Design a protein around this ligand. Structure first.
Ligand SMILES: Nc1ncnc2c1ncn2[C@@H]1O[C@H](COP(=O)(O)OP(=O)(O)OP(=O)(O)O)[C@@H](O)[C@H]1O
Ligand SMILES: Nc1ncnc2c1ncn2[C@@H]1O[C@H](COP(=O)(O)OP(=O)(O)OP(=O)(O)O)[C@@H](O)[C@H]1O
Ligand SMILES: [Zn+2]
Ligand SMILES: [Zn+2]
Lengths: 184, 458, 145, 96
């Protein structure tokens, strides 16, 4: 807190910056717990105040229902709100939120299989499509390509994508059968 | 030999990729022609014989030729997709995996959630020697090696990333010289990376558009067995014409709200059916003959189906379709029943659907207006308002078309990527390093040349 | 030309009442709601025809027995034995019907396809009678806005 | 009307700070200035945490600033909330 105050009140000090690099680890550790607000102080001047935020307070504030309460309060104050009572309504909301977060803290006590089946179907069906290259069955294709035919080229080109589409059909069928077995 | 086979294969790939969209519209035109011919299709007579009835008699060869042509065009559209859109999908996936490896440690620091099929499937591509096949950054493995090798372990990082460091060291050191002959067919076959092709095929199969095109081809094939299976291809008009996109968006903008409204309608109708089944059973005789009464509310399921099917579709509610309540001890109760059913179901809920569609229209129009207003009033890059630049005549447009053009920023990224790293100047090297570390501070935010040199320029 | 033809047939003078739109600019702003999204309205009608054609395909392939429109048992007037006749029946009668095609076709009780035909009628009512006419409603109101 | 109310809430929260009420452009003169201001300097969550800390802290252990804010809070005087002013606006020339 001391170093943060010094750095933020002397922003152009090279020596202070070097001290900040020397103290980076401690500042990084205490960054979540360090609070920072601005108030109009007794000297008719805007003063920046540093305080401590607790881990329990942070967790209870990040609880989803507290976030819903915050959103509802913001909606209300923006729509049916006047600037006279904005800071009064905000303080009331803060008090209620503090009480409910303390209550939550004190009451606090100290698809996977479908995805796996789909992945298995992918693995198996792709392995079937690749066994033709794995088996080294290219002797047959080599025998057809002893002599060039543009018709042979076109036939092989279309056959490759046709085999890919058939493999996709098998994959879809496998996924459907697996999903039926799961839901059964 | 091979240098010409591969060349002609590439020529065919390029042709199909170029004509993917033309073949995409041709498939819709042929589908419309087939479905127009199918309007002259008659039942002929104990098996019923579906017969194409026409005076000319030539529409049957026309139908078979059109069906065969539609199947061929569907296959060619699948090929065109594989030639044109699949590379973009693979590039995006490879980029995302690389970024999550480098800046997130998706397979070093923390592991996938086992609920992300994409995350689990992307585990395979890491070990492949053909990684960034499409993504430009070929040094992602080296970047991850430098970032996490000294802390998480050099050997296990190398094993995860599929790098042979010992072989690399031997190659850098003294090594024998070995030729490489690409003409060998065994070499051609063993060159391909099986595991990377497996991962790519998995990504393609999980791609939604490829699945839709496969469904299109399957329906086209089934159309030969039954010609009325060609009617499913008329559902392609929504994707074919973006003019139907904006009409259907009104329905799909609040589709969840519409589904919930239908569910609420079913719940309200179920409550009304409960009330009728408990108190107004005598009034649900639907048979006019006195011999056999057809009671529609003696069973809960039958009464609920009667309500949902007949009363909701009825203009005045269930009271339009159930008996008259005059001269009964529950006359006032049943009048309240019918009036409330008409008001809540026929009027209010259908009004909710009306309002949802109209509000979707209005919201989409407001979003378009907001986009136009933002682009007309503030610069995309710096974010400064139009008035400051407009102090000089045409200043905003000069700034947004010469100084801070997003097209110019895209062209700079292309030029910097396609330029050799050794040839980079000082500014280019600075921007390149920040881009490689994903630091977007070089983008001018809140400042510009005119604002920095305001007094010197003027 | 219409004024000249009116002498030969006096009812040709009724086409001149179409001139009120241009004569009164107050009707300009009412008709602009229709004409602001005229292309969208035409596309909505085309989509309605496509959806009704799909429903007619389904009925022609599975629900032909229910389209007898003649009350006399002597001669059945089958409205879906032909694809064109079934499509015209749908577009003309079912769309104009308040509850859909189920208001005008036979009752499905006591049949093996009862649930399928109930789904057919309910979906027809929801998509055609409710949603699409709602799209036209929204187009006109959005043009006003 | 409900959609317009939600849009208005979003627009207000995106264009002006909740506490001081100063527009986003003034802070945005510095890159990311508005977001830095609304997430570090004038965070309503930070203001709530300060109230919790000041309530849970012993009154004897209060510092000068804490005692000042505590007295104003007990008298329900919200003048300490910065309205129309901030650290950056007060020290505009000194900071930059
Ligand atoms: N960084 C920017 N780059 C380009 N235009 C910008 C930028 N910032 C704001 N604009 C504004 O965006 C508008 C240009 O729109 P845009 O280039 O997206 O397409 P368009 O004008 O709708 O037409 P087209 O598709 O033919 O290019 C102009 O009004 C321009 O002032
Ligand atoms: N005093 C303030 N404190 C916090 N945010 C503020 C303040 N003034 C304006 N904002 C703006 O409000 C937005 C933050 O919204 P908010 O914290 O209410 O929740 P959110 O972003 O909708 O999401 P979440 O519920 O996850 O926190 C930012 O755009 C921020 O600039
Ligand atoms: Zn700019
Ligand atoms: Zn503020």
């Amino acid at each position: 807190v001391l170093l943060t105050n010094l750095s933020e009140h002397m922003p152009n000090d090279t020596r202070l910056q070097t001290f900040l690099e020397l103290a980076e680890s401690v500042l990084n550790y205490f960054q979540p717990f360090l609070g920072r607000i601005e108030i109009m102080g007794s000297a008719k001047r805007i003063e920046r105040v540093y305080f401590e935020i607790s881990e329990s307070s942070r967790t209870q504030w990040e609880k989803p229902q507290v976030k819903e309460s915050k959103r509802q309060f913001i909606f209300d104050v923006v729509n049916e709100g006047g600037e006279k009572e904005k800071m009064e309504l905000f303080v009331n909301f803060c008090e209620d939120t503090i009480f409910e977060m303390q209550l939550a803290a004190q009451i606090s006590e100290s698809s996977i299989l479908t995805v796996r089946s789909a992945l298995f179907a992918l693995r198996y069906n792709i392995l079937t499509l690749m066994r033709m290259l794995s088996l080294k069955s290219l002797k047959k294709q080599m025998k057809k390509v002893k002599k060039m035919t543009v018709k042979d080229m076109v036939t092989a080109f279309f056959s490759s994508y046709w085999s890919i589409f058939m493999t996709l059909l098998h994959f879809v069928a496998s996924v459907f059968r697996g999903f039926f077995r799961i839901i059964c | 030999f091979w240098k010409k086979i591969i060349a002609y294969q590439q020529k065919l790939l390029n042709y199909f990729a170029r004509n993917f969209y033309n073949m995409r519209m041709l498939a819709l035109f042929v589908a419309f022609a087939i479905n127009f011919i199918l309007l002259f299709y008659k039942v002929s007579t104990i098996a019923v014989h579906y017969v194409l009835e026409e005076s000319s008699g030539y529409m049957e060869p026309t139908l078979r030729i059109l069906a065969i042509l539609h199947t061929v065009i569907s296959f060619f559209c699948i090929i065109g997709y594989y030639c044109l859109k699949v590379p973009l999908v693979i590039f995006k996936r490879e980029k995302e995996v690389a970024r999550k490896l480098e800046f997130d440690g998706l397979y070093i620091t923390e592991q996938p959630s086992e609920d992300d099929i994409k995350g689990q499937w992307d585990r395979l591509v890491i070990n492949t020697q053909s990684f960034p096949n499409n993504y430009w950054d070929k040094f992602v493995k080296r970047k991850v090696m430098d970032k996490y090798g000294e802390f998480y372990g050099r050997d296990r990082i190398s094993e995860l990333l599929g790098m042979d460091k010992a072989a690399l060291d031997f190659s850098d050191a003294r090594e024998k010289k070995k030729p490489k002959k690409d003409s060998s067919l065994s070499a051609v076959l063993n060159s391909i990376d099986v595991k990377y092709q497996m991962w790519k095929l998995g990504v393609v199969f999980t791609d939604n558009s490829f699945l839709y095109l496969a469904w299109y081809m399957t329906m086209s094939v089934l159309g030969h067995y039954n010609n009325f299976f060609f009617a499913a291809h008329l559902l392609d008009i929504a994707m074919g014409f973006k003019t139907l996109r904006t009409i259907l968006s009104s329905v799909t903008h609040n589709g969840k709200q519409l589904v919930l409204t239908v569910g609420l309608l079913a719940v309200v109708v179920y409550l009304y059916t409960v009330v009728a089944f408990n108190f107004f059973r005598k009034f649900y005789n639907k048979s006019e003959d006195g011999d056999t009464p057809d009671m529609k509310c003696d069973d809960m399921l039958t009464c609920y189906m009667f309500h949902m099917y007949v009363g909701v579709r009825a203009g005045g509610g269930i009271g339009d379709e159930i008996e008259d309540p005059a001269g009964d001890e529950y006359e006032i109760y049943r009048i309240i029943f019918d009036i409330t059913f008409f008001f809540f179901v026929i009027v209010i809920l259908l009004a909710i659907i009306q309002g949802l569609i109209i509000d979707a229209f209005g919201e989409l129009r407001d979003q378009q207006e907001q986009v136009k207003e933002d682009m007309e009033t503030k610069c995309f890059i710096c974010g400064i308002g139009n008035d400051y630049f407009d102090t000089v005549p045409h200043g905003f447009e000069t700034h947004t078309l010469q100084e801070h053009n997003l097209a110019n920023y895209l062209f700079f990224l292309m030029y910097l990527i396609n330029k050799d790293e050794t040839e980079h100047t000082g500014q280019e090297s600075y921007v390149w390093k920040m881009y490689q570390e994903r630091c977007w501070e070089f983008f001018p935010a809140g400042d510009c040349f005119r604002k920095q040199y305001e007094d010197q320029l003027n």
